């Protein structure tokens, strides 16, 4: 008899909290507009998830980026594929250690790959292209961070199918890693979550399945490549969501510790990622906004699921 | 002391014990991972890690499963987070045998400000140092590596800390499924029982080796 009045008090409070949550962000009837991503970026956020993935494809290399194209008026290479995985991991280290003057620390990973097309004629066969999925599938994994709206690099890793083949076959004396081989033995797929498309407005209605097509363009080209059976080991290596991919990338080198590098290499790496590659402080500040907005969107579905659970109990009891 | 309908499952060698309940078509599953480093005293007064467990409340009439991140302190119970998963209690959802549950899902808001109240006491938290790569040397461990711990929200503190009057109704809602203070008094006493039997078996194995 007490189960009905408890489940009805919760289902009424969750409906009251979801009602009071919408009217806070609503301004004069129209709901809260999400923050806009930068030019060319297409963000996909799965429903009921902790992360959101955005992609960007620079045709004809770096020279078609945003900063290299703005000029003063009124007076080939391989294409680059960007991918910024952004989880909801945001904390402040000034709570646990008051000596650290950091207000906000938000981690997000950047995966940049390159793909050779058939139209480039100038420098085709003068050297074997190592960025090609047919030859190594070399890809740069830049772990990034935002320390008080200032983008700081955490690590720069260069991963290929070689060190994915090395970890599965000969990372030990004659065998692979015993934990990396066991983590690949327990790989169950996640249920399909419907993704929401918070794209750039200019590319919102032009093409929809473009980050899906470039994800399956590389997955075909890597699985039927020079390295065939080591692509499931490379998928878990490049899997940015979970603890199995973080342990797998920690078995690789992890790059040099960046504050020990030269000051000329530190500024040239920041000039490449911000200026040349396009992964900017505008993109870095947008990720801190989009981690806040989509956390708010996931709180409302959490309030909708408290009410949905509490109503299903009271109608049963 | 023991709750009414709960079977215990503890094998020597693993620092885990799992409690299961079933009333009607609903199933209640409580999983605990005992810390090997040091756990706090039952009297509480005088590195002293709290006893943190999880409670899985599966209700097939609703179609969702409620995972409750709970912390037992002084025999009583606080609830730190509540998340919802699809379908019934699958075997993959429980973090037994060091394989985690579902990854990359929304963890939930803060139901209570217990972690902010511990820093007024200056109790040492789970996060030892600021550097996450420093604590990632002992990977796949919840107590010494909080940056990949499911029970510690992977180091993330969420945006919303839920309203007291709202989340008081959520804590009363879970107490009818056996997530009351009577369970947390048993989990507090059984974690101290596992911590003695694991340390005694590890010592006597070490005596015969040398």
């Amino acid at each position: 008899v007490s189960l009905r009045t408890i489940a009805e008090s919760l289902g009424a409070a969750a409906a009251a909290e979801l009602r009071a949550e919408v009217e806070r962000d609503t301004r004069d009837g129209v709901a809260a507009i999400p923050p806009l991503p930068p030019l060319g970026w297409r963000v996909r956020h799965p429903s009921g998830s902790n992360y959101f993935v955005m992609t960007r494809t620079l045709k004809n290399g770096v020279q078609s980026a945003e900063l290299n194209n703005r000029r003063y008026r009124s007076v080939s290479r391989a294409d680059v594929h960007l991918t910024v995985f952004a989880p909801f991991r945001v904390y402040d280290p000034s709570l646990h250690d008051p000596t650290v003057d950091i207000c906000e620390w938000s981690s997000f990973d950047l995966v940049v790959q390159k793909t050779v097309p058939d139209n480039m004629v100038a420098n085709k066969l003068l050297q074997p292209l190592s960025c090609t999925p047919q030859d190594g599938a070399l890809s740069m994994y830049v772990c990034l961070a935002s320390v008080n709206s200032e983008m700081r690099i955490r690590s720069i890793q260069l991963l290929s199918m070689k060190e994915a083949q090395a970890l599965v076959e000969h990372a030990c004396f004659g065998n692979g890693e015993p934990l990396f081989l066991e983590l690949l033995r327990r790989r169950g797929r996640r249920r399909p979550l419907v993704e929401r498309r918070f794209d750039d407005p200019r590319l919102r209605y032009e093409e929809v399945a473009q980050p899906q097509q470039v994800a399956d363009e590389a997955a075909v080209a890597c699985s039927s490549s020079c390295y065939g059976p080591y692509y499931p080991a490379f998928e878990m290596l490049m899997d940015s969501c979970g603890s199995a991919g973080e342990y797998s990338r920690a078995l690789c080198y992890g790059g040099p510790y960046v504050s020990e590098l030269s000051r000329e290499l530190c500024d040239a790496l920041l000039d490449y990622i911000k200026g040349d590659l396009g992964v900017s402080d505008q993109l870095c500040e947008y990720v801190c906004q989009m981690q806040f907005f989509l956390e708010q969107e996931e709180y409302m579905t959490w309030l909708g699921q408290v009410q949905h659970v509490a109503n299903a109990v009271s109608r049963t009891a | 002391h023991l709750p009414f309908n709960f079977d215990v499952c503890y094998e020597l060698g693993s620092r885990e014990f799992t409690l299961f309940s079933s009333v009607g078509s609903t199933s209640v599953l409580v999983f605990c991972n005992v810390s090997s480093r040091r756990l706090r005293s039952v009297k509480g007064g005088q590195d002293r890690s709290p006893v943190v467990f999880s409670a899985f409340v599966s209700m097939p009439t609703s179609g969702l499963t409620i995972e409750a991140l709970c912390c037992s302190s002084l025999g009583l119970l606080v609830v730190d987070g509540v998340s919802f998963h699809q379908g019934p209690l699958t075997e993959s959802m429980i973090p037994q045998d060091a394989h985690p549950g579902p990854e990359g899902h929304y963890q939930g808001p803060l139901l209570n400000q217990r972690s902010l109240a511990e820093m007024v006491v200056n109790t040492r938290g789970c996060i030892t140092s600021v550097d996450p790569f420093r604590q990632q040397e002992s990977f796949f461990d919840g107590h010494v590596n909080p940056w990949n711990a499911r029970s510690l929200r992977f180091g993330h503190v969420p945006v919303h800390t839920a309203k007291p009057g709202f989340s008081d109704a959520l804590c009363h809602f879970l107490e009818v499924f056996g997530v009351n203070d009577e369970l947390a008094f048993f989990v507090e006493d059984f974690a101290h029982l596992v911590h003695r039997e694991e340390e005694t078996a590890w010592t006597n194995v070490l005596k015969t080796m040398m």
């Binding site: 699921q305 | 179609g63 699809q86």
Partner: peptide, 16 residues
């Protein structure tokens, strides 16, 4: 319409 969206996405399931 948000509760309409979560039932279509599957966040609010039916009876199992």
């Amino acid at each position: 319409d948000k509760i309409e969206k979560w039932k279509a996405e599957g966040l609010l399931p039916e009876d199992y």
